[PDB]
Design a protein around this ligand. Structure first.
Ligand SMILES: NC(=O)c1ccc[n+]([C@@H]2O[C@H](COP(=O)([O-])OP(=O)(O)OC[C@H]3O[C@@H](n4cnc5c(N)ncnc54)[C@H](O)[C@@H]3O)[C@@H](O)[C@H]2O)c1
Ligand SMILES: NC(=O)c1ccc[n+]([C@@H]2O[C@H](COP(=O)([O-])OP(=O)(O)OC[C@H]3O[C@@H](n4cnc5c(N)ncnc54)[C@H](O)[C@@H]3O)[C@@H](O)[C@H]2O)c1
Ligand SMILES: NC(=O)c1ccc[n+]([C@@H]2O[C@H](COP(=O)([O-])OP(=O)(O)OC[C@H]3O[C@@H](n4cnc5c(N)ncnc54)[C@H](O)[C@@H]3O)[C@@H](O)[C@H]2O)c1
Ligand SMILES: NC(=O)c1ccc[n+]([C@@H]2O[C@H](COP(=O)([O-])OP(=O)(O)OC[C@H]3O[C@@H](n4cnc5c(N)ncnc54)[C@H](O)[C@@H]3O)[C@@H](O)[C@H]2O)c1
Ligand SMILES: Nc1ncnc2c1ncn2[C@@H]1O[C@H](CO)[C@@H](O)[C@H]1O
Ligand SMILES: Nc1ncnc2c1ncn2[C@@H]1O[C@H](CO)[C@@H](O)[C@H]1O
Ligand SMILES: Nc1ncnc2c1ncn2[C@@H]1O[C@H](CO)[C@@H](O)[C@H]1O
Ligand SMILES: Nc1ncnc2c1ncn2[C@@H]1O[C@H](CO)[C@@H](O)[C@H]1O
Lengths: 412, 412, 412, 412
């Protein structure tokens, strides 16, 4: 079930472009097409349907797996890529422009094949599978994003998890590169595609200085902006301060910011009261998963006029007469107003993704009520695969250097 | 003569978007709509048909002028903006996808109105009127880009220039922001729209360290890239070196680079021989005017296979089998793969444009053989308008301070 | 025992300057002078004898402790600060220019008072006390730097450690600001004081991309240098690559670098054979603790001439005829060629020291052979104290926000 | 006449250090010692007596010139370098700690040899020579700094100037590197030597966004500070805003800034009323020539108690009780609290110096009443000499490329 099966030829060129820029995932595909480690394994995945998800899902099929795919976000599907995937053997039930009903119809669709492994992005598939008492034949799962692992850890503290799950988000090759480097470029890209706004002179307010937010602040600063950071963590506010960024409350930032981007995993982090004090022409965007970081509800009630300027650009006139610009319906603007993270960075996360599924199948003595970090050996193999593909040589410790480091005394 | 007038409503929404972010040009429109300084003046323009050129030409029409507009590059025209301009009173002969005959047909159309003022971007319109012996009724003109000013300075050395022309490119409020800050964002934006390539880990080669090239290198570096500069000027190469960038010849850079962007006003700075030595997957883009900085004709002859991967992304197979990616067919990647400079920066550039046409009509005792710089009084009013629009106060010198600096003797 | 007790007035002005720039440590001092949590406690300390160490030990004296202090490095001691510290009640055995025999004689001196708590900087005091069986009355200790933590953990896996030790280096408020921010500024400052070298156009090689090396690379880049990273960890090599730095082996960097700075906890990281490959004029510096990161013993044997150019700058002429400049005899150049970390950054590290030393006395039911990280409560109190002192307001999470974070169930 | 002739050995090691780091000036010295272009010429110079002036002054002696040297600033002289110069053949009258009477006594000393050439830094020697009716035997002169060029240009408008003067400050290889890159590092180095202040977390105010101030802002930003710019020109305030810096008046910046550095050529730019509004602990420093940018005379009259904390750091207690720290007594902090610009950058400025003196001797048909910019041929030789010494290759323009640049017509 896709939007237009006629775009598969244009979409196929997009997956090959992504393949040529995912050398590490292509190297794993070769061991997969040779040892077929996922033979007879049925995978249910709710992921962002991109050209990069296509390289991972088709790499898993090369390992002998049967995959059912559903979009992780109702506006994230690249329609051409979904067409190209259907023309192959991928049971893809997703298209851009879904409604909330279509979203869960597509999730029930991927679930009729009765999967052994559950691959999820924001936590919805793990929640639905548990809330409707499936889980029976499920051997394990993986979680791709920060918000999904928090839901999964809450599930695990409640003794509700029924299969072991790998938090691929917690791998060094993921959150240090996907969340930071990838979202830094992608979020700015989405802002520029939805609006051709000048970054140079503007006061940009980044709410959240976690891995996503510090990458956004870095690239706003690299684009010439005056960066303001709002944080609730004492540690991360001091990090942003010592990195040269003005740190303050949203109450103060509400009056100065020209662009506000949210990168929390939290609710109404930009609230209706905040928006009332904002300047005329202020642009709002969200980079966390789920459209609840900005009070989009409040903005619609305090508003007396809405209109679309263009794709992903919505204008709201408040009673005070001032105009507020919402980007991408408050959904993660990188994947909705643009294409998400580059193919080169998703190479790393989808290498942990692919290898963590092989690890889940190869094992079955794991705890069905436990959230796992990626095994450091898999984490390290991904890094060596990327360096190998990039032609970067690293120093090898000498024997005298390995000896000196085990030592605590001296050497007369 | 445009592509589809059915887009006039969407394009109008784009021009209104530009209007709100070009506040300094809007305040000039107010004094223009009241004093009608260009009443009875007919203007012929070769500019990039964008939402920002739309705000400039309609600002000119408010001053009482009749305007004929033709596209400056055959792929830069925004079709909806061209439609919206047709719904108003602008005689626009341009559309995306033109041919060289269509380009010069649209220029001959512009010349039927017997223009009083000639507004040009790349110098193509000024050259035509002189080479085809029109210019009879022309009172003056303006030049927007570095390439056009060089030609007009060459035209003036041969005493073929027939009217005074203002080098709007040379105004401080233009080349310091349009050429540097504007192209820096725009070119990265165009690169990211034609390819979703990660800039962070890459070796980016910028050929040309003028105002355009240093803005591009700054933004490559701000996006995380390893920047290499190729320069032919000893001064600007030493500047690029002291700005922390690796400086070398194209022969050395060609074997190392992942992305090559050209920003000269010159010919074959990325040559046939350079591409033969480049890595597999190297991306080529041009930011200067005219498609001759990269030898695109040579690339077609050393190629055995060509293919379009996506809009504005052409793939070439070489005899060695290595693939070379060309962006926007070697045309300005900012204006062809994206939307050009933000409206906020073109506000500064088009304030000189509008004020320089008013300056040409108020005067008539200028040299019909001279390229002029923008009058410094106008140059300083543009910056004061932006600051007044942005809410930035500057310090005013006290009288003891103004006197101290006219003094040179012993004692203060 | 200090060099000249007559400088006690000059040192006092230096210690008072630090007090004004360690505001968070002063509020701990006020709560110490009132609650005297360290009554009847004798402390033996091996630390860098600086104005900031003076503010910490006197904060310890105010809490009712008796302190014996010995220098952590034979060239780090500020003699006036030691004089000023002796004029009060601090048993300080240290001066600049010490011999290695003086170093270990001074350690027996502070160890004569039979301390209950051991404060060590590079691990030397923890080792001596253990190899010579003086742990009998020692109730606990603290460790300040990464190299000391590695030694203590080796003692811990080797099960010889005899008291609990708090790894103060591993606190977020320590390694994120002290190791990263402080050493970045301090090392560049030391390089500039021993040489007024131009950083801008130069190739600077940072060996080690941990917290110290990334801070050094950040400040080299900010001072205009072209930064090259050498690393042995695949994770950290990819971290350096994605941050825009060329990553290679020492074998390649040795022939291209102008400045070499070491930031490993390791031995012979810049070897005898690397220096023979270096260019005429290359500068060598070390920022990790202990002067064994640069093969300075090897450099002296392959050299034919050595001479002092100025304070902390020794020039060596090689058999090749080329000149190699060594800074501060390969000892930590930040603390030897300059004054170490600013007072504002050591405020954070020495707040952890005081609060974690008080924590060692508050308890006594802790495990022998156990290295602990700083309790997360104290780590956060240090962070909140700095924010309060800097006047920085942090955002407060609402009740609806704390609820949405525990949920994993469907419905928004 | 110097302070201590016994320091001549330490100074010579410092001049040798500069010679090894001024390769381009070392290349001119050999052409000078061979072609003796300045034989029989007497030169009187008022410059900062540094290891870098020593390399230039001895380079002039190598060309056959007789040189008398006096310090340009009473606290800038490097005493060991002055001793080393006196042991050679340099009539040097300078020492650190001069009084204003000593300053002009020393200028009369160097003026007793009746020089044909005047080398000046801040304009004082040009002013004295004109105000006391000498100039009789003077054949020409040079000006090194911006402040001197303004005074000399007023002398030209007043028709008082009696010999031709070369504005060495206005050459690209000077103001693009000395004023910007050199002073940027130099000023931060001086601040760090007078105080070990953390730059990272601080608000730094740069008053003046010319070539000096923008270099200082670049280095504050590179050291992690939050940079605020105060400007009086609309053009440069817009330059500072688009470079990402908060721009405001001194009245607003005075209440926010932690460090204030002045880089104007102007008077009372930091006023007494401004200082009373400042935070407690604010640091003041000056980078423009002459100690009048900060109202230091006003600050001494508003204070109730003053004391020196360390070299170049005085603490002032204000009537409101707040503490204000002044650096280098309001004088160039780069040259008084540190060692001025690195030798690699002064290589460029003193190469223009050396080459422009010979150009003054080669000629005598220049208007003996006019200020000239450095001849473009010499500016270009300086750039190529530096590029060759650094091993940097620049691209050579093709014969086809040289033609395409003079063409203007349609096609070819
Ligand atoms: N492509 C993408 O856009 C992308 C990529 C990866 C992760 N993510 C999503 O981004 C979000 C964060 O990712 P992260 O890895 O940065 O997690 P993270 O939790 O490290 O960053 C979260 C930060 O938000 C701060 N925060 C929480 N409530 C706040 C409030 N009310 N005001 C201000 N700051 C507040 C926390 O202190 C924390 O530092 C998650 O929702 C994750 O799923 C998005
Ligand atoms: N929106 C845009 O895309 C935009 C904006 C402004 C200008 N431009 C175009 O950009 C080009 C230049 O802009 P500029 O303002 O940088 O002009 P500029 O001439 O200052 O910069 C040109 C630089 O190219 C260097 N150069 C020339 N030939 C070279 C070669 N063979 N190898 C290396 N370097 C070489 C020159 O030394 C000079 O420094 C012009 O064609 C102008 O029309 C485009
Ligand atoms: N004021 C200071 O100078 C200061 C402050 C804190 C720590 N330190 C010292 O700095 C050193 C490191 O501190 P860190 O916090 O950076 O610890 P860290 O372990 O994060 O950094 C160590 C890095 O060194 C790299 N490394 C080890 N051997 C290498 C080799 N042979 N070639 C290349 N890279 C190699 C490792 O990969 C590791 O990433 C330690 O000696 C620590 O005590 C100094
Ligand atoms: N080694 C050094 O420290 C060094 C080197 C070169 C020049 N200088 C001195 O530095 C000073 C500046 O040199 P420049 O080359 O920067 O010249 P410049 O004139 O480009 O910079 C001066 C800036 O100060 C601004 N200004 C004047 N009054 C102001 C005010 N009241 N408030 C705010 N801004 C104001 C002017 O608009 C101008 O942009 C000169 O006095 C020069 O002699 C010092
Ligand atoms: N191009 C992409 N394809 C697939 N997933 C992506 C892409 N870009 C970002 N993501 C993922 O989207 C998640 C946010 O929901 C992040 O965890 C991130 O890994
Ligand atoms: N969005 C835009 N609209 C109109 N002209 C533009 C735009 N972006 C760049 N330009 C102009 O294009 C010229 C290059 O031909 C530059 O001089 C620049 O001013
Ligand atoms: N100014 C300083 N005063 C005291 N200790 C310092 C200073 N600068 C750095 N250090 C410490 O020196 C140690 C290196 O041995 C680091 O752990 C660091 O915390
Ligand atoms: N180290 C130095 N030696 C000599 N002159 C210097 C030095 N640093 C800066 N200057 C000069 O001082 C002038 C400012 O008075 C500037 O023109 C600059 O060239």
């Amino acid at each position: 079930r896709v939007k237009d099966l006629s775009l598969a030829e244009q979409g196929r060129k997009q997956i090959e472009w992504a393949e040529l820029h995912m050398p590490a995932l292509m190297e794993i595909r070769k061991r997969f097409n040779a040892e077929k480690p996922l033979d007879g394994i049925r995978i249910g995945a709710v992921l962002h349907v991109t050209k990069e998800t296509a390289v991972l899902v088709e790499t898993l099929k090369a390992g002998g797996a049967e995959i059912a795919l559903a979009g992780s976000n109702p506006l994230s599907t690249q329609d051409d890529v979904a067409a190209g995937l259907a023309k192959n053997g991928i049971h893809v039930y997703a298209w851009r422009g879904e409604t909330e009903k279509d979203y869960y119809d597509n999730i029930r669709e991927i679930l009729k094949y009765e999967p052994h492994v559950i691959m999820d992005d924001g936590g919805d598939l793990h929640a639905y599978v548990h809330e409707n008492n499936l889980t029976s034949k499920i051997v394990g799962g993986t979680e791709e994003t920060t918000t999904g692992v928090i839901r999964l850890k809450a599930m695990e503290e409640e003794k509700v998890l029924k299969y072991p799950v790998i938090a691929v988000n917690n791998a060094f090759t993921k959150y240090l590169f996907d969340n930071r480097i990838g979202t830094g470029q992608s979020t700015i890209d989405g802002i520029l595609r939805a609006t051709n706004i000048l970054i140079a002179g503007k006061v940009a307010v980044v709410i959240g200085y976690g891995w996503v937010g510090r990458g956004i602040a870095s690239r706003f600063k690299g684009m010439g902006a005056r960066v303001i950071v709002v944080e609730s963590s004492p540690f991360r506010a001091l990090e942003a301060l010592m990195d040269g960024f003005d740190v303050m409350t949203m109450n103060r930032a509400s009056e100065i910011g020209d662009i506000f981007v949210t990168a929390t995993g939290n609710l109404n982090v930009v609230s209706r009261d905040h928006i009332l004090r904002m300047k005329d022409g202020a642009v709002l965007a969200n980079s966390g998963h789920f459209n609840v970081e900005i009070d989009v509800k409040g903005l619609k009630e305090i508003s007396v006029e809405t209109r679309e300027v263009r794709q992903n650009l919505e204008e709201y006139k408040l009673r005070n007469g001032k105009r507020i610009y919402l980007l991408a319906d408050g959904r993660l603007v990188n994947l909705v107003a643009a294409e998400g993270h580059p193919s080169e960075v998703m190479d790393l996360s989808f290498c942990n993704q692919a290898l963590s599924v092989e690890h889940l199948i190869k094992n079955k003595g794991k705890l069905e009520n436990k959230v796992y970090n990626v095994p450091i050996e898999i984490d390290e193999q991904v890094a060596r695969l990327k360096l190998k593909a990039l032609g970067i040589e690293i120093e090898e410790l000498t024997i005298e250097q390995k000896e000196y480091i085990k030592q605590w005394k001296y050497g007369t």
